[PDB]
Design a protein around this ligand. Sequence first.
Ligand code: NQU
Ligand code: NQU
Ligand code: MG
Ligand code: MG
Ligand code: MG
Ligand code: MG
Ligand code: MG
Ligand code: MG
Lengths: 5, 5, 236, 236
Amino acid sequence: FPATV
Amino acid sequence: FPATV
Amino acid sequence: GAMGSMERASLIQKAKLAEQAERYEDMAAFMKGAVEKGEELSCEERNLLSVAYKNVVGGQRAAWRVLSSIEQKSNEEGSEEKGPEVREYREKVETELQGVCDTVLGLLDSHLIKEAGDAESRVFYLKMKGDYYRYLAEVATGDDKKRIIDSARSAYQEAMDISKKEMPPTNPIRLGLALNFSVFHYEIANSPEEAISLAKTTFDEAMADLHTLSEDSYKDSTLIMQLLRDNLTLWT
Amino acid sequence: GAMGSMERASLIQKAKLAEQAERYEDMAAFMKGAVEKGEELSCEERNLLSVAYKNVVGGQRAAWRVLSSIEQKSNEEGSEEKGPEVREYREKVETELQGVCDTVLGLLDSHLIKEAGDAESRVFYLKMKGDYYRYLAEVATGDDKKRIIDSARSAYQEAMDISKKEMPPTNPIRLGLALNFSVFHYEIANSPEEAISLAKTTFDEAMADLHTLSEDSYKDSTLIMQLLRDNLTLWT
Ligand SMILES: *CC(=O)NCC1CCN(C(=O)C2(Oc3ccc(Cl)cc3)CCCCC2)CC1
Ligand SMILES: *CC(=O)NCC1CCN(C(=O)C2(Oc3ccc(Cl)cc3)CCCCC2)CC1
Ligand SMILES: [Mg+2]
Ligand SMILES: [Mg+2]
Ligand SMILES: [Mg+2]
Ligand SMILES: [Mg+2]
Ligand SMILES: [Mg+2]
Ligand SMILES: [Mg+2]
């Protein structure tokens, strides 16, 4: 899964 | 803390 | 609301305690109470709100993905029929997730966004709006999936427009917004090229402005830049 | 009860799904429903019950310890007065923890223990009884602390007596019971010598019986033996 903040 | 199961 | 009798300051104090105890459901409930006092939130308080709900929904999303994978496997050729339980339990988790999203969206709509005039607050809340519509989109399969996706897109786009006009390219909120909108494009909108372009342009424009920053600001901006790079590496 | 309408088998199925999703509150609620169907539990089902509640209460205990440490610090000389919030929130977590313990004890009393005739089931449930009274003891400070401690001791002792008569010294339930009763002695009963003696004797008697075991049984027994050794290393 890609990075989110 | 000591081990418990 | 169960928090109606508690002082605003006490709710904020307890949210911080809950964070230290990794009690994120409690943290979120305290912050919901604090928002419902009706006053605007400070930066620190906005962060408490976001951290609480990010952690609650993050756990729900992870559980939903486990259950959805089991369910998909159950519907493959040669899979033995095991009854409605997997679907039921995935639906239970899904419904609880949708509830949390609806709660957050509700706080934003009543009345955090409309009272937020400074760019930093407004962009922060609009990013949240995009994020929680994105989580709704992740689980949407019906007649409203398109409208949910568009709601996320619209919130992100308003936030991007304000951020580009009002904030430097290294601002952590601007960077995090772009990171997340890029993921929206890749994972939700079936637009990997747009995702990659946004991440690259955001990274490069931030790089060019790092020279203006103090050591402490540099730390934060570079951390998010690395997340952009990490996604780009994943996608290329 | 909210699980009254769900089939026993479906509750068990969903408990297993909840475990895979790391949804331990759900897992516990499903297993409570399953117990309340009124039938005895199989070994696998007893394990689901114990795992669910161990994880729920384990998280509560960790949170309680964080909050108790903050509270203790607040009551040191030179600490600035911050109002009742720390105590209130510690009390909230504590009350929820006590509730979970009371729920488990309630299931054991109505009617798991009384229907458990085989040594393996009876010892398993009596160990649980000791464990959940031990968790109540950890947070007890009032007129009943002594009686809570004695309740834990009595449950553990009955389990030890049955286990010594009916189970080999390598049996994992017997070993885990002894491990936990030893921790009770050290942490709750202010009896570190008894704790150390029990752990050592349990370890040595298990060592002597390993030769009787298959590879798979050996694996389980040796894992718990290592926990005994780990405690002994901590304590000596
Ligand atoms: C009130 C306010 O300005 N809040 C935003 C800051 C931004 C920095 N930050 C972080 O925790 C990290 O970055 C973001 C977090 C959340 C958002 Cl919306 C954007 C950025 C977390 C990732 C690594 C850099 C720091 C504290 C809250
Ligand atoms: C129905 C039944 O026989 N349950 C007991 C087993 C024992 C082995 N085990 C474990 O998960 C480990 O050991 C224990 C867990 C729980 C208890 Cl009460 C005793 C031992 C966990 C620790 C390392 C060895 C295996 C499965 C359940
Ligand atoms: Mg007030
Ligand atoms: Mg649904
Ligand atoms: Mg553009
Ligand atoms: Mg039936
Ligand atoms: Mg109390
Ligand atoms: Mg003895």
